[PDB]
Amino acid sequence: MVSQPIKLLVGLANPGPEYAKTRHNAGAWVVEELARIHNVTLKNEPKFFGLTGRLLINSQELRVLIPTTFMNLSGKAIAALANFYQIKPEEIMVAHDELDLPPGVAKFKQGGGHGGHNGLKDTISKLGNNKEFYRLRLGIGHPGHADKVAGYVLGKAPAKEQECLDAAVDESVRCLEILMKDGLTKAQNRLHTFKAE
Template structure:
């Protein structure tokens, strides 16, 4: 398994979207940057907040696209072209409707499952789906018609705390994830439930 060079946290820009369910991926990157004492700065050429960090002795790029969710791919594409990052060296951290709050799962490849951020990244990478995904569970509102409003609102405090716990738990495995030791991580992270 290849190691990861670029960690992308998905979300929507603007204070009105802070701590909404759809911003779980961005929340992870902000927490990782803080933990690594890395200052994320807006980088125009990457259309996002960007930073460089050393994880397990390996230089990694952190990115939170500041485009809206459904245009996340253009930020990822720009950074990949500039730094010659391959799709299999990318880990995208995003909210996942199909997992309950308080859980997180790791996988490589697959479809977009209706997630507009993933859909745009797959498209901008030339339909390549070989990147890694860290999926932060946010739960499902119960009906497809309610999804848009659900992901763009803040979770009630009990749910929000569970999402935060799942992010914190995932952060504990960042060194192993970046190094490509995914099986070890999956064995423990996948059984975690806040």
């Protein structure tokens, strides 16, 4: 129950209103919703290259971060904040859009590659070439063709598809609450049975 590894939750993003509802900001959506439910307004802290907060959830202290960097420079923010607060890579969960899962699905994972995701790739680099941070993989689906991936992830999902996304965001937030109460195994056990329809 009370033991779980996460001290910092990061939602990857590109900055500003034109990118806010693009697929590549899916991780930020999770952080935004968790903050909203827990009555925290994020603070722009230039020292941390991002928007930051602190939540108390089942007596566990959870810091949150939405970088204001380019997506490919996300690691600057994550490292700056984690090094200041003495948070290890293994105590970070990074929420991000996942091409290899469909809209409406999300999964937790420890470690792994970047999958060609520019934010994950920088995060690995800037955390001392350490892959062993946790991930919240928010499915966004994948276009046919490799050459279309950048355009796809920088696009806005159409309405019905966005409903599936928003439903997975919602469950992901519920399951982050469960992570903080019941631990990772039970949180994962619930999240991995979810599929938005």
